[PDB]
Amino acid sequence: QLQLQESGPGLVKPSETLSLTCDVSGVSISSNYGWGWIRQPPGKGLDWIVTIYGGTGNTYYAPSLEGRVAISKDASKNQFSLRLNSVTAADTAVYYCARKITYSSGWYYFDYWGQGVLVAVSSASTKGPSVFPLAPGTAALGCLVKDYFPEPVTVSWNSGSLTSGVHTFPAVLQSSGLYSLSSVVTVPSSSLGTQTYVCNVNHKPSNTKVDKKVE
Amino acid sequence: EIVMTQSPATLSLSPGERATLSCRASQSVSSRLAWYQQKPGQAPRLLIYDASNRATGIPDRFSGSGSGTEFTLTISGLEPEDVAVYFCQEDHNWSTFGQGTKVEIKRAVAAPSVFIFPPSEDQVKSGTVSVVCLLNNFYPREASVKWKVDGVLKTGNSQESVTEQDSKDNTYSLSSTLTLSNTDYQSHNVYACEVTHQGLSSPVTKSFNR
């Protein structure tokens, strides 16, 4: 009974407003905890945006343009949301919601964090991926997830059953403005035929659920 | 604003010896500081609060110390699972995070397992062809990947992607993708990728014809 789940669109056009909601369970949004939003741009570190305190209703904002940032509690749905309008390309990041609790000093710290939702800011539209099999004492096998937008993509290899020797590589950004992904798995030599392999690649933004079987 | 800056940017130490992560603040902030750990691909976890207190469920090898503008996070005796980025954080009721510090646990030199993947026939139907070169479980991280098309070097049409350091064996894996067109791929025979690594006395080459 304590869980924070971020929710919101993974892609927002520029100059629009991104809205993200944090589902809180096991604890009331009205108890005097701190509810904050922290983002992480690709490659950079964490960056605090805003905090709102249940009970007091106090809000605290990091330096930004007047009225860009907005935060709001909701006791009926037991959630707190963030609104960031006039969004530019520098707003693509991974956004986390977290809880603040005091300690002996009387000041708050983010003790429990959320899974985090990543939002991209561009004029590019959503595109579904293509999946291509990758086959050549130890052997290798993989799937190529090509030409999709935006991130992320989930790859598992026999519906989660096989996991040792699996590597899903960080997605690359091509010249075309699309992403290309590869997920491999190291396999014993005498297994190319004895055991079948089916990469499970799903892309939520485009609703692409494909189980691709190799060789 | 209270700018929080961390040092060093990167670390590389073996298990057993301690790592000292530093943290400087603009103005004095008393002990109102926390330390967070962010394992690759995960959300941050609270390690220290009030500058010198270990949070619940944290191994005793993590320590916090410092007061005013200078603080220190100590990891007495690194473990393989300690690979992460560490964040210093100031809190009045405005919060300010540091820029982070990458901790890498240095490992025995391990040579990569090189694999090359020819394109699928379904892929040559589209007109764009990708050939993937795979490096598996190598250390150190720095590595060279050369793409050669029928002997000649092909530089300008490939992209690399290196995973995070594994939290078990502390190795890396690299994936290079060489992209060509249908008419360009079907106009040459042998395709190879040559890798150079510290764990290799000689560069190895994996290739295929057609």
Residue numbers in the entry:
A (entry chain H): 1 to 35, 35A, 36 to 52, 52A, 53 to 82, 82A, 82B, 82C, ...
B (entry chain L): 1 to 210
Q: Mind quoting what the paper says about this structure?
A:
In the present study, we isolated and compared four nAbs from three rhesus macaques that were immunized with a group M consensus envelope called CON-S. Although, the macaques were immunized with different CON-S envelope vaccine regimens, the CON-S nAbs had immunogenetic commonalities, and were able to exchange immunoglobulin chains with each other and still maintain envelope reactivity. To investigate whether the antibody sequence similarity between DH840.1, and DH846.1 translated to similar variable fragment (Fv) conformation, we determined the crystal structures of unliganded DH840.1 and DH846.1 antigen binding fragments (Fabs) at resolutions of 2.7 Å and 2.8 Å, respectively. Overall, all four antibodies bound to Env gp120 where C3, V3, and fifth variable (V5) regions converged.
Antibody DH842 was recovered from M172 PBMC, and DH845.1 and DH846.1 were isolated from 80–12 PBMC. Despite being isolated from different macaques vaccinated with different regimens, DH840 and DH846 antibody lineages were both inferred to derive from IGHV4-n and IGKV3-d heavy chain and light chain variable gene segments, respectively. In DH840.1 these amino acids were V29CDR1, R30CDR1, E91CDR3, and W94CDR3 in the light chain variable (VL) region (All antibody residue numbering and CDR loops are designated using the Kabat numbering system). The same amino acids were exposed in DH846.1 VL, except a serine was present at position 30CDR1 instead of an arginine and aspartate was present at position 91CDR3, instead of glutamate. W100b CDR3 and W103 FR4 were oriented almost identically in the DH840.1 and DH846.1 antigen binding fragments. The DH846.1 VH differed from DH840.1 at position 99CDR3 where the inferred germline amino acid serine was encoded. Although the heavy chain CDR3s of DH840.1 and DH846.1 had low sequence identity, W100b was present in both antibodies. In agreement with the immunogenetic and Fab structure similarities, exchanging heavy chains or light chains between DH840.1 and DH846.1 resulted in chimeric antibodies that still bound to CON-S envelope—albeit weaker than the wildtype antibodies. Both of the two most potent neutralizing antibodies, DH845.1 and DH846.1, had no unoccupied trimers and exhibited 3 Fab to 1 Env trimer binding stoichiometries.
